[PDB]
Amino acid sequence: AAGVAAWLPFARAAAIGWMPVASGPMPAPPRQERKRTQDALIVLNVSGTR
Amino acid sequence: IALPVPVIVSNFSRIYHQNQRADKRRAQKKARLARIRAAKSGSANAYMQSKRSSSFETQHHHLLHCLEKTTNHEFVD
Amino acid sequence: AAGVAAWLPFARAAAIGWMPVASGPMPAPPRQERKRTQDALIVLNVSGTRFQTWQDTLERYPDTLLGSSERDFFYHPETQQYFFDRDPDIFRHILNFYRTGKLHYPRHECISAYDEELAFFGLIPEIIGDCCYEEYKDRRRENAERLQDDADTDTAARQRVWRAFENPHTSTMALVFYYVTGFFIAVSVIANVVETVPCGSSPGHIKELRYAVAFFCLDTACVMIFTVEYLLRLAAAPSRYRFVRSVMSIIDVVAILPYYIGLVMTDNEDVSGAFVTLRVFRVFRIFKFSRHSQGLRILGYTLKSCASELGFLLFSLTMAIIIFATVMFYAEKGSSASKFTSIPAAFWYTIVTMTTLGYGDMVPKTIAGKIFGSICSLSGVLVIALPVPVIVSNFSRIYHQNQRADKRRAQKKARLARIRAAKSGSANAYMQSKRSSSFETQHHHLLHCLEKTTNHEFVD
Amino acid sequence: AAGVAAWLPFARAAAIGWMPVASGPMPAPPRQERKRTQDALIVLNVSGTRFQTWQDTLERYPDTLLGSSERDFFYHPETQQYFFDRDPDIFRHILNFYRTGKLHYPRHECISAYDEELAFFGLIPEIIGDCCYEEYKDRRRENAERLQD
Amino acid sequence: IALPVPVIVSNFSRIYHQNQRADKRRAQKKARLARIRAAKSGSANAYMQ
Amino acid sequence: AAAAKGIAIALLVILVICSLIVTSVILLTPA
Amino acid sequence: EGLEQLEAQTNFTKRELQVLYRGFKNECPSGVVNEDTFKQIYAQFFPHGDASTYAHYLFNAFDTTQTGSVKFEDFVTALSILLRGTVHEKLRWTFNLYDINKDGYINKEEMMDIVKAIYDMMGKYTYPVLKEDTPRQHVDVFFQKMDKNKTLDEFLESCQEDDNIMRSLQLFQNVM
Amino acid sequence: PEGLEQLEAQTNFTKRELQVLYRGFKNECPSGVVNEDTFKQIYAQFFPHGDASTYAHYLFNAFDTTQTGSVKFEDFVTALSILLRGTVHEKLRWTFNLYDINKDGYINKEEMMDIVKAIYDMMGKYTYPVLKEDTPRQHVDVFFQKMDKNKTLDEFLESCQEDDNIMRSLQLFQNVM
């Protein structure tokens, strides 16, 4: 689920598990805006506390 | 004779409270497991909708498609 | 005083009040560095939170740490702001103290940390403005007694021998030492019980012609055991006479005196109607069971802890007894049976019905008897059940205290074992360093210097 | 122990007490650096507010996460401040422990969250000061019986 | 009969607690007034110095 | 437990022999 | 360590390494992940069937030295060799994962329980309606692609003899 | 004791280090006046070997002049200064006062037995050459070798330079810190 989105690479490695037993076109990644995690901390303020 | 009666009655009241709270807790646990089943059903239906036509869901559905192709069996409602 | 230094101009105007009535040289102002209040807010930091405040407020109270000059050590010139390493939320209350002039105490924060922080800034504990004092002193006393129970300092030639004898559980030794005494006191008291049954020892089946008087032999043996045990205790007392006055010791000595006094009476002049009193004290051997079960000791602590209101119980019971008896007797002094012959003969009625006991040996006859008898029964319920909870709740609280003491003793021993383990780990680390993150290096170096100055080496 | 580094010179001073009786090569100090103190206020912001503390104060307990070289996982370079993603309140008590050595525990805190934040930073429950330990153990007991049910 | 006895005994215990805490409070007030007198004496002695 | 049970029996025996000493004393003075 | 482990034991950048570490720590604050966390995460990624046994195999591959709970060092090493290493490292990892024991050869039951771990992932809501028939057609076809003689080297050379499997690996290599 | 009054004047420390010393001092004794009871466990925990309270007791009264029963920061930092970064001549005067226990500055061979046995008490039981009851008095006799055979502070102060062990042992911490 989306609650553990920090652990996609894990399952990515898990994907490599079932490669030789695969039979299909391997529809390839749906691409991305950035394959990184440089998204910086966003200062959200609440009544004067950041 | 009055020395141990408060202890006995306090223990009895405590045990009755434990029983009633355990019953309420079991009802709560049933509700929680129902909610988890509903969440899985919702994720499955979302994947169904994506099959018909957020950043994370893209790669999640991509891995689901990879599982689909590695077994050449598609998913229905 | 200095606590209202913001209000000097007020008194300055007040000075103008007594000018025409003055007669002197008017010694003029002692001058000043600045006749203003431009002293800016000084950013004083506590572990990463900035608590800005005005200088004049800080030197309002001199003797505290933030007042006077001892704050210079905490000054941080390279960034021009005071720094403290303390706790922010705690320090907020000390900050409030300067603003107002009286501290407070949070409902919900550890008294040890709060008190150590309070003493760190050099301000007296009792500045509290009697708004949280009722709670601060409560929690402080609770912590003080907690650490007093932390200080049980229980220990382990004969100085340790007698203590080990007193030790409840030394497996093979103390268990035997206690079981023999328990069995022997039990058989003594059960002998005193059975020395009365007809077939046991009394003319129950001898009128025709077994009445085996061996309970005298058993009593002699048992009391010999008591007196040798008490001689062992007397030789075991760290203070011989000073520890005689103890409760358990006095029970023991009165558990043995009746036998000796009876023997002395046997060969002394015989006084009629006196041996019954001596035989009565034969039952007090059962009191020795105090060492058997701790519940008796808890009960003794209860009755001598809430010993204040027990006097009130007795006094109010006497009041009620007298008041109701003096109306019972006059209520039906003249009747058919007229059982209530006199007030001391009505004490028995007003106490058999105040306790809600109820016999029927003497009951009211006149109508005026019934109303006041029922009133007496209800008043007895009230007065009897009034001081009950102050005793049973006190007893439960004391029992919980005595359980908590054992739990914390076990925890303290585990903590001490962990301290020893950490010390052994430190020695192991030093040995590892010798065989083969700067503080450990410097500590090993200092121990190496010890090695040379005392020409001895360290081995596991 | 390792938490008394601030008194390290004092022990050094105590050495002078036995110099006349000393008889040895005196291995001499092992190339220490920065004779005068250049301690810098290291700042730890925990999803928001920031706590400033020294380095020697933070490093006297190397077995934990804020000690050792583990904390360098959380160094956030372009701002030069450790950005822990934890709760901004319990961390105050953890820093208090580093300052003293006896960690405390207030009452108005959920055990699951407090214990999670306590184990995250590598601390262990038994370090709690005796003053708060009883109340901690009672709360842990009631939550444990809840999870038992 | 058991209905009103808990109320009566609770009230009695409460009143006894009020009395004892009032005595402790009066002792505290005596201490506080002594402290105020001491503070005035200290200020006077400081002026003397 | 069992180790304590062993010394429990051991002390039971010494209590019994003390009682048998008492029985010997009472039998010393029959009638 | 994190101060020297920049690329010595991994193929990850410093920022990627630390963010992956924080992601790992948010799930297992003790720093060491057990098998139950593996079932939890892997199932939560696939909230439509059951894949506990496949996650068991994955952890057993991950858990070197049979310690029972893998630390972060070996976990990140495995991720690096899986996602940003050479194809030989991926094939070695497939060897280790498929070799449920410490043997050399691969037998029928290994493909049996692996294909069960794959087929139980879906459930009972697929159009083809999977049954017990399909898994051992799949395993049979694997076996005719496998050597006729009753080999890890043969499985390798079959991997570098087919283009589809070779191209089935880089598409995850570049991203993340 | 103002933090700027007790600078290099009368306390040969830089103010940057003195602030850190005070911060670490009050962090262990918040009241600012250390008692001898605290003086024991703050020290014994340096050595995971046998206890050191005996030596610390003799250290405290030397630290605490006029028998105040507790040491304030001014005297503590004064002594720490004259030790760590003080004068070689002045370094050993206090230590002569330390070794002296009969108050007046005289030596009657008994003030060294206890001090040397306390110093030897650190190692405890895990020493390589196992301590024997004769070893402390033997080391006391070794110290008696270098004291005045004739029947002293003057000879000790004039012979400490003669024994170069003292000379380059005092300089271990004089230069550092």
Numbering used by the authors:
A (entry chain A): 2 to 51
B (entry chain B): 398 to 450, 472 to 495
C (entry chain C): 2 to 157, 167 to 219, 224 to 450, 472 to 495
D (entry chain B): 2 to 150
E (entry chain D): 398 to 446
F (entry chain K): 28 to 58
G (entry chain F): 37 to 186, 191 to 216
H (entry chain G): 36 to 186, 191 to 216
Provide the publication's sentences verbatim.
Modulation of voltage-gated potassium (Kv) channels by auxiliary subunits is central to the physiological function of channels in the brain and heart. Native Kv4 tetrameric channels form macromolecular ternary complexes with two auxiliary β-subunits—intracellular Kv channel-interacting proteins (KChIPs) and transmembrane dipeptidyl peptidase-related proteins (DPPs)—to evoke rapidly activating and inactivating A-type currents, which prevent the backpropagation of action potentials. Here we report cryo-electron microscopy structures of the Kv4.2–DPP6S–KChIP1 dodecamer complex, the Kv4.2–KChIP1 and Kv4.2–DPP6S octamer complexes, and Kv4.2 alone. Thus, our data suggest that two distinct modes of modulation contribute in an additive manner to evoke A-type currents from the native Kv4 macromolecular complex.
To investigate how DPPs modulate the properties of Kv4, we solved the structures of the human Kv4.2–DPP6S binary and Kv4.2–DPP6S–KChIP1 ternary complexes. However, the focused refinement improved the resolutions of the transmembrane and intracellular regions to 3.4 Å and 3.9 Å for the Kv4.2–DPP6S and Kv4.2–DPP6S–KChIP1 complexes, respectively. The structures revealed that one DPP6S binds to one Kv4.2 in both complexes through their transmembrane domains, forming an octamer for Kv4.2–DPP6S and a dodecamer for Kv4.2–DPP6S–KChIP1. In the structures of the Kv4.2–DPP6S and Kv4.2–DPP6S–KChIP1 complexes, the DPP6S transmembrane helix hydrophobically interacts with the voltage-sensing domain of Kv4.2, specifically at the lower half of S1 and the upper half of S2. Structures of the Kv4.2–DPP6S and Kv4.2–DPP6S–KChIP1 complexes adopt the S4 up and S6 open conformation, like those of Kv4.2 alone and Kv4.2–KChIP1. Structural comparisons of Kv4.2–DPP6S and Kv4.2–DPP6S–KChIP1 as well as that of Kv4.2 alone and Kv4.2–KChIP1 further support the role of KChIP1 as a modulator of the Kv4.2 S6 helix by stabilizing the conformations of the Kv4.2 N and C termini as well as the intracellular S6 helix. KChIP1 and DPP6S do not directly interact with each other in the Kv4.2–KChIP1–DPP6S ternary complex. The structure of the Kv4.2–DPP6S–KChIP1 dodecameric complex supports the additive contribution of KChIPs and DPPs to the modulation of Kv4s in the ternary complex.
